[model samples]
Target: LNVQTWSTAEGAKVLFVEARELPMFDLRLIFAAGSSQDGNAPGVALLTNAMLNEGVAGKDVGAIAQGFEGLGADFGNGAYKDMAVASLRSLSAVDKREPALKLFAEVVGKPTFPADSLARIKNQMLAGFEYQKQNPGKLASLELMKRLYGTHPYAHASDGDAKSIPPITLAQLKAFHAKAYAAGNVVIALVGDLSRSDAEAIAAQVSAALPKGPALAKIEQPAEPKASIGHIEFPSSQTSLMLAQLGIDRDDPDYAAVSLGNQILGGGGFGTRLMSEVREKRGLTYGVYSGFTPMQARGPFMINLQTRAEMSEGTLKLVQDVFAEYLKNGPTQKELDDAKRELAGSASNADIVGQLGAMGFYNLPLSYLEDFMRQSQELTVEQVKAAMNKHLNVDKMVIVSAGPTVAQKPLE
Candidate 1:
């Protein structure tokens, strides 16, 4: 994309992609203050993020949201397990852009963590937690993460649980935000109708005004878990099954091979083995997909699906069988092309900003996209197979299911 990248005086990375097609701009500040950095606090990272837009300065949540509305702009901020980010999408016109950006900065640099809002949000999250218990997919995913990661930072779901949620104090939230949401720990990504100089000015202003907190340490690599099965009892007709293992890192040397291979294996459509065998041919599931969520460290390579509770064991076996065969045989030339085909896209403002956000968050190289495109196209079947084999062990998968009954060996 020939994107321009530079660091502010305070060491905050800034990347910009100019898209003159639209009379708007997308601005984002990504920080490493995610749940992985929650240290002693289980859900502090996400709690702090939830409190971000509640109120900042003298403005309350409603007013802040309406402020953007009047300007025909939008604001967004959220925290996940990997990162916390705040964004502003405003008209290119200075009148609208300046106000929206200012509001965004306040939300980023100075979330008030209003006492009333804090209590309300905690209650909301607690309610959400109650709701999660009713979700089979969520329960299965949580069980999978806990079993797979063990003592790693990723063990708990990003949203801190009921006990963890209630204990978070405003002082604690402020502390987490100050350090995790600092300038040096952030990446500023801007895309749309703006000049290099203007983009530079925006980045400098945002970073300079941000708290100068310490950079977060990298998440330590998690030790591999032995093959295990976890089942969460839930009153559901269909069981949610999640099978996973430690996947490739964002900076993996064989990223292209693994990424494309994953596409062919399950990240694709009807042609993928996961779908063709598990869903289309057998009619066990409406859909089945697998993907590697390459994070700063080895992230989860997951295959997820839901099937009738009685068929859970059979479906699980079928999915596992499909994986075993694919790992042995690798992607066909046709499958590889399907993986490569969908990647070619039209550039839009949102697309540019999203790409920059990912690259910035991962400390990825500036030419990541170009390199990935070239590598994805150049990758051969054997290369893809090798990468998959190097990172994945079919027998070591941690399988979890949320259903009335457990899924185990079937037709044996």
Candidate 2:
């Protein structure tokens, strides 16, 4: 895939790839207005993004949604920890494309944030809060992030907490949109059968359509959290445990190596050290998994699992031991080979537009995918081990668990 990248006069970065297999196009606008940008108000970014398509000039939510449907176009808007995104998928034929773009442009550039819509979304979020309170995994994760991020922008969930959600005002939403949704602060990705000229036109039009503002400042580096364990009392038969620490950034050179090593350690489902040792051998729990969430800032590398309350302590000890051992001995040659085979074989056959959006969000060069594959194929066992050790220190991590208090038992 040949990716063409450039900037619009209004300063929006654009990445384009022409896929002729279908007469359709996918477009995405990425903004640096995620939860991290919520300086004081935790849920402002999320609610603002959610309110985007609720209404626009002369149209209510119903009319706006119906307009997109009438043109056979799809629109999606969402916010995350690092960025907010609005997307469009529509036919390329001029008849369908023109109206679709018009409606999409309106939705992106102008949102009414109707008072009624804000009330409804806020109530839904509040209801969700009550639901998550009863979930062990959610409770564990919530506490884990707090311990890991403290006063950092990433301390709270993107959707925010109960206290933050209910009081979000329409004025805050409008102010966020005015600055965060600026043309200059966004990345636009286009993939489909559109020609270079068409792609350029679409990108330029969208760029000129939005309010203008500079890119948001980069997120501050998070402090290394103390290695501590926390617990939340919950009346459940199963306990959820999460072990995490600050991980590498998207630009980390060690990313590929650590990611491959992670699969061998716990990310890969069955053959991984964590799964084999903790599950197949001991049958501690139904399953366990691990992942590295690489974002603009140092995201978290986490090991997550659930086990019977009676076995919680034992299960956690076993997982921790497995982690320390992996760091010391690294992966076996066989494990490394297996990881490479599976990861390389699992190519992304999904949406290019979305993939491009990710690249832009990370501020990656257009050669990113090409470089990733080339690096993936050449990684050695030593490299993977060193990468993991460099980014992770067992001595500094935040561990949290949620379940009924139980008398811990020694391993058999």
Candidate 3:
């Protein structure tokens, strides 16, 4: 994929990819304003970004929604641990493109968090928080994050907790928007039947009014959690389990090796090591898997599963054994070669929107696609094993379980 890159006068990074095959354009305005920057307010970033499309000057959420439908355009926004993104997809024709871009710029640059809208969104989120309590999986995941991240900003959920959201004022949201939602802290990605000049204009116009602010502060590495198991009792017949440890950052040199290693270990679906031992061979659970989330900072490498309460302990042991064995002796040479071939073949399979978004947000080199295949193909079994050993250790992991309480048993 050929990419054109530049920086706007306002200091925003921009990436453009021409996909002329489709008569449509997709634009993304990404900011370094994820939940990690929600200093005193856990959900302020999320609420502020959500409120972008909710209301703007002279336009209510309903009018905005209707306008998009009328123009046959799609506008959406999302917040993650590292960033917030607002996206627009519209037909490339001038008639459709102009109005859509105008409205999108309005939403992105000028959001008015109306009191009524804030109340509605808050109620909705509070309801979700209640719903999450009944979900064993969510409960286990949340607890696992808290245990793994400790005092890190990543410890809190993107959606603020019940205690946090009620007190979040509209003024606070506005203030946060000014600090975080700025051209200097944002990256722009444009993909579709657009020229370099058109893309540049679009990028400049969308971010024209975003206040200039300093770049977001870098996140520090989370401290290693002591090996321990914690449990939350839920009245469910099945248990939800999560095992996690800090994994690699996006720019880690060992990414290729760790990614391939993860595939062979558990990320490779049905025939992988975890599935073969835990489910295919023993029938302990329907499925089990593990993978690394390479964020700006070291993210979590998690192994997740759910099974009958009676089988939770044994299942966990089986998973731990599999991970231990893999670390001791990574994939065989033949296995490594096969994984290399598979990974190389699938390098170009990434969809346009995802590729553009990641490349733009991460500030990946234009040669990233080429480099990915090169790195994977060149890795040896020894390299993969060494990389895994450097980043992971079974004994240092954090474990959380949710379900009916079982007989207290020491972790192996």
Candidate 4:
């Protein structure tokens, strides 16, 4: 993909990828308005974002949905630790594109935050929390995040807790929206058949109505998690296990090497070392995987698995043993070569909007993916090993498990 990037006069970043092969386009507007910025209220950021689509200046939720669907367009939104996104996919023709964009702008720029809608959304979220309470995997993951991040901004779950949701009034939602959904904090990713001029016009139109606040403050780096195991009792038959440590930053120079190494260690599907040892070889579990979530700052490198209640202890040991061994020796020459080739070959299948959104958010160079493949192809076993050794260490990790009392045993 040939990416064209620039900055709007309003201070928003603009990224465009021209693909004339199809008469359709995908536009993504990303802002530094995710849960990390949820200062006093834990669920405020997410609630504010969710309210955007419920109603805008003059349109109700049904009207907005019908309008988009009527135009053969699609709209989506999501909130994460470091960013919130609003996405639109529409036909490139003016008739279809213009109406879709108009509604999109209203949704993103002029949310009404209806009082009834707020109550409905809050109830839905509370129900979700209730459901999460009974999910072993969700329980383990949430506890693991708390242990890994502690009191840092990253500690709060994106959907938030019960105590934090009930008190989030519409006034707070509006205030959060004004401060967070600003042009200076936004990044626009446009990909498809549109010309640069058309793309520029779209960017301007979308960002023009945003509040002109300054960029958000950078999140402070989280402290290293001391090695410990946290367990939550449940009545499930299987244990949900999460072992994690702070991983690399988005701009880490060794990302290519470490990512490639991770593929061999656990990210390469069933053939990965983690799966090989934990499943195919031992019959301990059906699946196990490991990966790094490189974010604006150092993010989490995690390994997740599930096993029978009676086998949780042995499964945890086996996982740790595999992780320890990988960190100590890294991937072998053949393993490294296989990983490099597999990764390089798979680059073409990536989604365009997803790639462009990531590059825009991370402020990566337009040629980031191409450069990644080139660098990955040149990686040697020694280089990947060194990178792995630098970024991944089992001794500093926090491990968490949730399941039956017997299955939640802490690792000895």
Ten residues in sequence with the least summed lDDT for candidate 4 = 341-350
lDDT of each: 0.86, 0.89, 0.86, 0.87
Among these predicted structures, which one has the highest TM-score?
2
Root-mean-square deviation of every model: 1.8, 1.3, 2.2, 2.1
| Candidate 2, run of 10 with poorest lDDT | 346-355
User: Which residue segments of model 4 deviate by more than 4 Å?
Assistant: 347-350, 407-412
- lDDT of each residue in 280-356, candidate 3, tens digit only: 88877798989999888888999999988877888888889899999998999887887777676661212565666
Q: Write the per-residue lDDT of candidate 2 for residues 305-392, one digit (tens) a residue.
A: 9999998998899999999999999998998998888987751213677878889888887888888878987999999999999999
Compute each candidate's TM-score over C-alphas. 0.97, 0.97, 0.96, 0.96
TM-score for candidate 2, please give it: 0.97
**Which candidate should be chosen as best, given lDDT against the real structure?**
2
What local lDDT does model 4 show for residue 407?
25
Clashing pairs in 1: none
- Over 1-412, each residue of candidate 4 has an lDDT whose tens digit, in order, gives 6788898888899888888888899999899999999998998888888888999877888999999999999999999999998999999999899989989998998899889999999999999999998998998899899888899998889988899999998889888898899999999988887999999999999988777777889888888889899889999688899999999888889888888988998885678999888888777788898899988878999999999988898888889998898888888888888787777677211277778888988888788988998998898888988899898776888999898876244432
Candidate 2 contains a number of clashing pairs equal to 0
Clash count list over all predictions: 0, 0, 0, 0
Q: Between prediction 3 and prediction 4, which has the larger TM-score? A: 4
Give the range of the ten consecutive residues with the poorest summed lDDT in model 3. 347-356
